[PDB]
Each structure stands twice: as structure tokens, then as C-alpha cells.
């Protein structure tokens, strides 16, 4: 003689996608700060299967960055009212500019780069200068699940993002994930423990990008070594335009990557490293922001090799950018007074593949969502279903 | 203190010892507008579960005894087969077909019929 009984709080969860809020220890401000000591709960005897390729978190993070970035150019000065000579990376261009008053004009001496120039922006889109007060310094961001949900973390040292996870834990909030806008080279990302691993949506298909995660970080310095100057020309009223790697450590890393490639292409086959074949400039180049000025550096000096079975790079600057293939919107970067120096860790690669025993690998590009996937592979969102009914042979008192 | 969802991989019998841990952590200008509807959804997600708990003669947390006899067709398993050799995730999978049948039987099952007779009984 057995009867139904209602249990509340039973550990039952299902895969789900929802809106996630933010946690931050100027874009990061207004984002609910993190708890001084988070709690991580291990799920004994639990095996959960992950699919990093079909994660909704990435595409919610990606859609968050795009739409939060345009807000960073809304209260900023619009650059709609915008003869050159010198090879010369920059060109001293002169032009007539409106003053405070509509009638009067002003001649100017400015310095733009060859890539920004009529400027290239007008052919495609309107343009807005960034607010010089806000900063683009990367700071760790935690993505959190609201009540009634939870986030599962795969506590595996070596994980390609798919299949069963024998040691699962759950947290309310992801770790401090760096939103670092880098291309080709992942900068300040998560470092894999022990052996390096490789991840691609489809290994058989060459067209699918191939994400590499370092275990040994690669120190990398880039520097804009010329002391520039800023004269704030008055394009009123009120608005104002601001006018102007170790080779010893890299082969150790690569030498681990061929061992990391392992049986995926075969032990016998040779592994060749070649520069990107071409495309958009954001793909061809290790593009990233450093000190507020956007760096574009040629990585052909790192990817020239042919590995049998048994270090400075050039750099150029663009004053304006249309990141995320966003057209209609363009940002001018107001330059910074002084010399710029950065020191970051290269934490991973994005790589593509070609269509015997010849394997060609190029630096990565395309969607920036892949780089978020270099952080969100350990995570997936689940919905908590706490109501349960079962028999226990107790009857209600009457 | 095994934590939130701690006994997930444990048997049903042992996981009902740690019920109060998943129940307390069940409620736990643009841009910020995306954290608001998460708070808002959190309470309608919580009141929905407790309205049932209310339409059902429970409300009282964690455990609740019923006057619905478990017809065999729902499981046909000795309670030892269920409490001592099965997890809640497995059990929720077996009964998935009959769950909404039970949910409907609960409310009608006693309270509609149970609260009414108490009204008769509490007259005298």
C-alpha cells in the first residue's frame, strides 16, 4: 500500500537558455559586483554531457558586447564634419574645418595613417569619435545565472568541449572571463592545465576554425614608440575633435602543439605553418587594442615552418575601426599623449586549414565568437526543476 | 553540508536528506535592464511552483504526504527499487509521461474533496 508524496528541492535540472546578468569585482560599472568568496559545489557520481558548439552563452555574450559597445559612442562627440602629403606610415593632411560659428572656418595640421584615408569611413558609414574619458582596459567579467537556474562547470583538466564530463560542479557565476578583443592570437585567456588541447566544431571539415589553448603562456610586448601630441581643435559648439615575442619561447610552444595535434591528422604527416592567405584586415592581422591605440601586427614571422615527424613582428595603426563588421557605425580613436607599451600573455591561437601528408595552418579570424568559446567551453546553463512526486507509503493525517 | 544540488548523483533516498539546500537557493537605464527581468522571472518561476504546492494540500516545505494512492501503472516498482537504486534525474525520466496526470489528481484528489469535507466536519 503506497501513496504519492510531494518533495520540494529535489536535485533535478534540465538544459536551458535564458538571460544572464553580469558581475564585476567603464562598461563594467553598473554590473552587480561579485561575492568576496564564491561557492563551488561538486556533483559526485554525476556525468553531464557538454556541447560547446551549441552553447547559447557565447551568442549571448557576443550579442552583449556588440550592443554595449555602441552605447560607448552615444554621449561622445560626433565627427560628421569630417590635402595630404607623406614610405610614410602617416600623412600630414590639411583640411578646412568649421569653428564654433557656422560662417568662420579653420585650417589644421593633422596626422592620420595610410589605412584611415577623403577618409575611408565616408564611403561606408558615418563616424563618431570615442569619449576620451572612458577606457577600453580589459577587466574580468563573470556571467551569472538567476534564481531557479544554475551553471554547470566541467572540472576536467583536459576537455575538448563535447562528450561526457565525469566530474561536474555547479556555480552561480562563471570565472572572471577576459573580453579581450584579439585576433589570431588569444591574449590573457584561460590557460589549460598540463597538456595543451585542440578544439574544432568539425575536425573532418577544414573550413571550421581550429582553436588552440596554450598551457605555457607566451610573453609578448608591443610598443608605439613615438611621443605624439594632441591639439584639441575647436569643431564647436562644445564638441571638440582631438587632432594629432621570443623565438626561444615560441618554438617550445609550437613543439608542444605538434604533439598536441597527435593522431588527429596522423603521426606520420608533416605539419606546415603558413601565413594567412588573405581576407579582411581584421583576419590577416593580430589585431587588438593596447593602451587605447589599436594595434595591427603581421604574424608571418611566427607562422613559417615545416615540422617533420622527428622574434619581432611588424605593427601598424588604424585611427578608426568598424569592429564586428558593423556598418553605419564607425569610431575614431583619439590618440594618447606619450609612448605606449604593453605586456600581455599569448594564451591561445585560432587556426584554419587547407582543402598526401601536407597540413597547412593559418592564423584565425572571422567571427569573434570563437574567442569567447576559448573561455565558455567549461560551462552550460541548466534550469532547476525542484518539484518531485514519488511513493513513500505515508498517508496524510485525517 | 554537501551544497547546492549536492546529492544529485546520489540515490533518491539519500538525496531527500539534503532537500533544504536546493530549496533555499531556489530564490537565492539600459544594460541593467537585462538583470531586472532575471530578478522578475525568478519570482514568477518560484510562485508558479508554490501555487501548485498551494493548490496541493502542502505549502509546508520539503516533504508532504498525500491521499492519492499510487496506481501501479505509474511505476510498479518496490520502493527499494526506487529509493535505494535510482536517482531523481532517472525517476523524473520514467514518470515523465504520468506526471501531469498526478499533478491534476493531487489537487482534485484531496483538497477539492478534502478541504470541503473539513468544512462539513468543522461545523459540529
Amino acid at each position, epitope marked *: 500500500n503506497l501513496w504519492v508524496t510531494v518533495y520540494y528541492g529535489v536535485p533535478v535540472w534540465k538544459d536551458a537558455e535564458t538571460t544572464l546578468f553580469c558581475a564585476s569585482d567603464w562598461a563594467t560599472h553598473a554590473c552587480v559586483p561579485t561575492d568576496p568568496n564564491p561557492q563551488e559545489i561538486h556533483l559526485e557520481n554525476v556525468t553531464e*554531457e557538454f556541447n560547446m558548439w551549441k552553447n547559447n552563452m557565447v551568442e549571448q555574450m557576443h550579442t552583449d558586447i556588440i550592443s554595449l559597445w555602441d552605447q560607448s559612442l552615444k554621449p561622445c562627440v560626433k565627427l560628421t564634419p569630417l590635402q595630404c602629403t607623406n614610405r610614410g606610415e602617416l600623412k600630414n593632411c590639411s583640411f578646412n574645418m568649421t569653428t564654433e560659428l557656422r560662417d568662420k572656418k579653420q585650417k589644421v595640421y593633422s596626422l592620420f595613417y595610410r589605412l584611415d584615408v577623403r577618409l575611408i569611413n565616408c564611403n561606408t558609414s558615418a563616424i563618431t569619435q570615442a569619449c576620451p574619458k572612458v577606457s577600453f582596459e580589459p577587466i574580468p567579467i563573470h556571467y551569472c545565472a538567476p534564481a531557479g537556474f544554475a551553471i554547470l562547470k566541467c572540472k576536467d583538466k583536459k576537455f575538448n568541449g563535447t562528450g561526457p564530463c565525469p566530474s561536474v560542479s555547479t556555480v552561480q557565476c562563471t570565472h572572471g572571463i577576459k573580453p579581450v578583443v584579439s585576433t589570431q592570437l588569444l591574449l590573457n585567456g584561460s590557460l589549460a592545465e598540463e597538456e595543451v588541447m585542440i578544439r574544432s566544431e*568539425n575536425i573532418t571539415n577544414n573550413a571550421k576554425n581550429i582553436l588552440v589553448q596554450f598551457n605555457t603562456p607566451v610573453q609578448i610586448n608591443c610598443t608605439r614608440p613615438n611621443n605624439n601630441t594632441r591639439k584639441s581643435i575647436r569643431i564647436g559648439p562644445g564638441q571638440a575633435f582631438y587632432a594629432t615575442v621570443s623565438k626561444a619561447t615560441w618554438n617550445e610552444t609550437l613543439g608542444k602543439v605538434v604533439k598536441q595535434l597527435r593522431k588527429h591528422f596522423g603521426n606520420n604527416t608533416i605539419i606546415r605553418f603558413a601565413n594567412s592567405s588573405g581576407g579582411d584586415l581584421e583576419v590577416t592581422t593580430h589585431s587588438f587594442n593596447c593602451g587605447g591605440e589599436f594595434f595591427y601586427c603581421n604574424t608571418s614571422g611566427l607562422f613559417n615552418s615545416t615540422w617533420i615527424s622527428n622574434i619581432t613582428l611588424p605593427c601598424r595603426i588604424k585611427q578608426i575601426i568598424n569592429m564586428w563588421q558593423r556598418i553605419g557605425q564607425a569610431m575614431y580613436a583619439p590618440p594618447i599623449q606619450g609612448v605606449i607599451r604593453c605586456v600581455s600573455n599569448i594564451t591561445g591561437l585560432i587556426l584554419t586549414r587547407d582543402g598526401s601528408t601536407t597540413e597547412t595552418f593559418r592564423p584565425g579570424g572571422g567571427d569573434m565568437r570563437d574567442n569567447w568559446r576559448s573561455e565558455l567551453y567549461k560551462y552550460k546553463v541548466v534550469k532547476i526543476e525542484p518539484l518531485g512526486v514519488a511513493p513513500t507509503r505515508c498517508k496524510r493525517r485525517v | 553540508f554537501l551544497g547546492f544540488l549536492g546529492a544529485a548523483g546520489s540515490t533518491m533516498g539519500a538525496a531527500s536528506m539534503t532537500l533544504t539546500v536546493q530549496a533555499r537557493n531556489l530564490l537565492s537605464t539600459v544594460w541593467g535592464i537585462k538583470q531586472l527581468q532575471a530578478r522578475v522571472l525568478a519570482v514568477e518561476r518560484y510562485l508558479r511552483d508554490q501555487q501548485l504546492l498551494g493548490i496541493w494540500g502542502c505549502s509546508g516545505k520539503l516533504i508532504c504526504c498525500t491521499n492519492v494512492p499510487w496506481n501501479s501503472s505509474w511505476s510498479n516498482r518496490n520502493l527499494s527499487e526506487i529509493w535505494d537504486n535510482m536517482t531523481w534525474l532517472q525517476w523524473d525520466k520514467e514518470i515523465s509521461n504520468y506526471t501531469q496526470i498526478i499533478y491534476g489528481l493531487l489537487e482534485e484528489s484531496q483538497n477539492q474533496q478534502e478541504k470541503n469535507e473539513q468544512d462539513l466536519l468543522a461545523l459540529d
Partner: antibody
Amino acid sequence: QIHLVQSGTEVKKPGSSVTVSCKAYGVNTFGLYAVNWVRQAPGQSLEYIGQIWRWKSSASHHFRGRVLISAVDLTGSSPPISSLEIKNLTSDDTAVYFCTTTSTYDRWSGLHHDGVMAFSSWGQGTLISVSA
Amino acid sequence: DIQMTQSPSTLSASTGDTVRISCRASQSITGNWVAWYQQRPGKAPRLLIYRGAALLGGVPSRFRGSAAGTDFTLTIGNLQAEDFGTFYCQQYDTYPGTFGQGTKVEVKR
């Protein structure tokens, strides 16, 4: 799309062994799909031989210990592949052998019940004839 | 092991007919862990129905199954030419999964 292609038809003599291959095209990984090997005797009903799920090999009690079922994940060269090896053939083993692929990513699918599952993808078939 | 006894062994019908194939198990399968398969001679079986009432993606609406206790029934209304063949019920409640004897569906003449 998922296409499962098996090895060619093979003729074998009693007491011999044999390994049948199965290329799983369209399958993303055997971490999110399980492989079940089923044989159908001539003009007969189907019979479960074994499976491999979560990289765990297993076989039915009738065929237990007599058969070895291995599989290897995806490579850049080739799609993931499973292999059904049967030792010490008898004439009662003359049957057609089928590859099975069923998605395992979702717990609630109802295709699978704690490793015991139905069969969502199938192959062309391998005729194993055992005769002296 | 579960023993699936299928019935009838052979049935005859015509296009547009509504036809019902029964399959009994030795034990009762509460979880409804039973699948149905169609196999035309020579080609590989197709998974039509899993878990009783669940249609697999791409299987026509006219295939519908019902599961109560030990008995199971596959129902094909508006019988079509493509539907003729042999049908098998398969349980997967207890290891190992077991199939039925099968049911042959021939044309009336």
C-alpha cells in the same frame, strides 16, 4: 546528414574471426552519440549484440565475451568509426550486421534509457556468411 | 530479458485502410520504453516511433502508437503503398533490448 557505411560482405569458415567496420559520416562525436551493433539472422528477428556508449564497451549475455566492439573518434582524415569483431564463428552466426547511431546529448530524449536504447540511425548492412 | 510477443504475424490491407499491430511484453513496461520499426525487404529498418507516442522527425503523422501496461499497439491509418512491409516492436526497458517476432503487412487481392 548522418550516413553510416559498413564494410564489405565477407565469407568466413567456422572457427575464424572477423572484424566489420562502420564509418559514421555526419556524426559529430561518439561522446554525443552511441553505437549499437545488431544482427538479423536470415528471414528472422533482430538481436542485440552490443554497444559502445560513453566509451564503454559492452555485449549481451548470449554474445558476452565472444565479441569485441571498439570505436575511434573523429579525425581530420576520417569520420568517427566503430568496429564489431566476432571470434569463433558458427553457422548460427550467419546473419546481416547493422550499425546504429542514436544521439545521447539530451537526458530526456526517450530514445535511450540508461544505456538501453532505441536505434535512430542505421547502416546498409554486412552479410557475414559462415560455412565450411 | 523482456520477451516481446508481436501480433498478428501477417495481416492484409489496402490503401487508405486503418491497420493496427499489437505487441505484448512478458513483463509490464511502465516507462513506455518501446520502439517501432519498419523494414522493407533488403533495406535497413527505419525508426518510426520511440517511447510509444513519440514520432521520430520525418515520420508521417498517420503513424501513431499507444502504450498501456503490457500491451502496445502501432496504428497506421490511411494505409499507403510505401507503408507495406514488415514491422517490429522493440523494448528497451531492461537490458538487453529485445525485438518482437515481427508483423508482415501484405496487400489485399
